Write a protein that binds this ligand. Structure first.
Ligand SMILES: OC[C@H]1O[C@@H](O[C@H]2[C@H](O)[C@@H](O)[C@H](O)O[C@@H]2CO)[C@H](O)[C@@H](O)[C@H]1O
Ligand SMILES: OC[C@H]1O[C@@H](O[C@H]2[C@H](O)[C@@H](O)[C@H](O)O[C@@H]2CO)[C@H](O)[C@@H](O)[C@H]1O
Ligand SMILES: [Mg+2]
Ligand SMILES: [Mg+2]
Lengths: 134, 134
């Protein structure tokens, strides 16, 4: 139900998205989205504690005119229910780089070579403490 | 039309809201709202460069079940169109304290005696760089 949605960003390559949130003690999933609008996402970042058949797996994807792209799963899962977590994301026209709080990083392709991000959303089983993209 | 809305906060007295935004070169107004939901706000903070008959004036108010309260106008106006600005807000059951970037502060009464903030919004003539409430 509850969530954060912002359509008033003006983020560009070289800037860093930093999101901090407090994970519910029974957290099943949370989502961070970046893009142009809800139907056009260069990144959907979805740690699944236990959701949609995945356990302790991050699912990433893109969304183009409402259509989900090819999923990319990551096994690094430094997320503890009931605690604060921080995720940082940088990007350029080739890839987004996701930096997890244990020092794991991975790339997700910038499939539509998006160079301006004006939309973000954060929702699921956590309460927001910080969103910065600067 | 664009803006930020979050219903997934869990802010408590002793935590500080910090908002950074890039003001449009022709900015007329921006708004920061805090409360339970869009109809129930312990603080509506509205710097008006030139809007609704006010020039370089901050208008603050509360909103109770959809009804605006008594306005409080502040003359301190350390906001420059085309630049980044930062506003910090603290609160307790008595008052919210607004801390402006030039060191001016003022209090706005917490009329609804709200001790938990789950909702915030930021919109108007700026682009968000940071929202933190922690
Ligand atoms: O791809 C992100 C998207 O996934 C949806 O669930 C997928 C699921 O991960 C996959 O295993 C299945 O094959 O297709 C489902 C439907 O596309 C989620 O529903 C959605 O929220 C996103 O997370
Ligand atoms: O009170 C905040 C609220 O003000 C509305 O405008 C007011 C205006 O400030 C006041 O001078 C006039 O008497 O009543 C108007 C309507 O309540 C704004 O429209 C609204 O956006 C808020 O900023
Ligand atoms: Mg949420
Ligand atoms: Mg008054």
């Amino acid at each position: 139900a509850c969530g954060l949605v912002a359509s008033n960003l003006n983020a560009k390559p070289g800037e860093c998205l930093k999101v901090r949130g407090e994970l519910a003690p029974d957290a099943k999933s949370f989502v961070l989205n970046l893009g142009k609008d809800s139907n056009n996402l260069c990144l959907h970042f979805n740690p699944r504690f236990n959701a949609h058949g995945d356990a302790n797996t991050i699912v990433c994807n893109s969304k183009d005119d409402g259509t989900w792209g090819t999923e990319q799963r990551e096994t690094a899962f430094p997320f503890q229910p009931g605690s604060i977590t921080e995720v940082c994301i940088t990007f350029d026209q080739a890839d987004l780089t996701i930096k997890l709080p244990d020092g794991h990083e991975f790339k997700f392709p910038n499939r539509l070579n998006m160079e301006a991000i004006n939309y973000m959303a954060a929702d699921g089983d956590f309460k927001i403490k910080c969103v910065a993209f600067e």
